[PDB]
Ligand binder design. Structure first.
Ligand code: HEM
Length: 189
């Protein structure tokens, strides 16, 4: 994946766990030779997956737990490393934003020309509810989507309940996420 993902992982770990840890994790993963990650440089996917497994071990947290946290972090990280304007243009509400994710990764592709973006399809079951279809060229990153949606909840000041209703490793087409999202009414009543 692009070095931007790998720096984001480095920055997330260096923030919550201090720099000694991150360089322990970097060693377990087998990546000392890489003196640092370049955002715009494509890397073998190995680099990302190996960091996650190294992080899981050194930190004693499951891959799934780290992915869920990363997914939330990425929302923040992207808006602060100079992609705030893409995020902003993609929508002014969760439902709007969800429908333009492919369009967003299309726009990202201009800056990152070897991107292998994910694919999202939105089925609006109401103005409080949606089915999210996630399709990926890769395995094992459905948990990141949990995290992302939690970040997007905060983004739109919306409370988002997410249960994954379909799982690819049970032989389904794509991961499906059933999504319940409510604003001010959660608070006042
Ligand atoms: C400005 C905002 C964003 C940027 C710059 C961005 C960029 C990227 C990049 C560079 C990758 C790595 C893929 C590769 O190198 O081939 C990626 C992966 C991914 N992005 Fe985005 N992204 C953005 C927003 C989002 C948002 C809002 C979501 C919300 C759901 C999302 C979901 C994902 C997922 C799930 C992956 C994992 C790859 C896969 O499924 O195969 N991204 N993105």
């Amino acid at each position: 994946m692009y070095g931007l993902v790998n720096k984001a992982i480095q920055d997330m770990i260096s923030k919550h766990h201090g720099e000694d840890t991150w360089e322990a994790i970097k060693q377990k993963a087998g990546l000392e030779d890489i003196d640092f990650f370049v955002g715009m440089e494509a890397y073998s996917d190995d680099v990302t997956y190996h960091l996650v497994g190294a992080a899981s071990e050194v930190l004693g947290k499951p891959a799934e737990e780290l992915l869920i946290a990363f997914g939330e972090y990425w929302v923040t990280y992207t808006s602060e490393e100079g992609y705030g304007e893409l995020l902003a243009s993609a929508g002014d509400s969760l439902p709007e934003f969800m429908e333009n994710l492919d369009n967003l990764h299309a726009r990202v592709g201009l800056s990152f020309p070897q991107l292998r973006p994910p694919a999202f399809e939105c089925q609006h079951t109401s103005s409080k509810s949606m089915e999210l279809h996630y399709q990926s060229t890769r395995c094992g990153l459905a948990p990141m989507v949990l995290g992302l949606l939690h970040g997007l909840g905060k983004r739109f000041q919306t409370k988002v309940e997410v249960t994954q209703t379909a799982f690819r490793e049970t032989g389904e087409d794509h991961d499906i996420f059933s999504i319940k999202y409510e604003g001010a009414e959660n608070l006042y009543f």
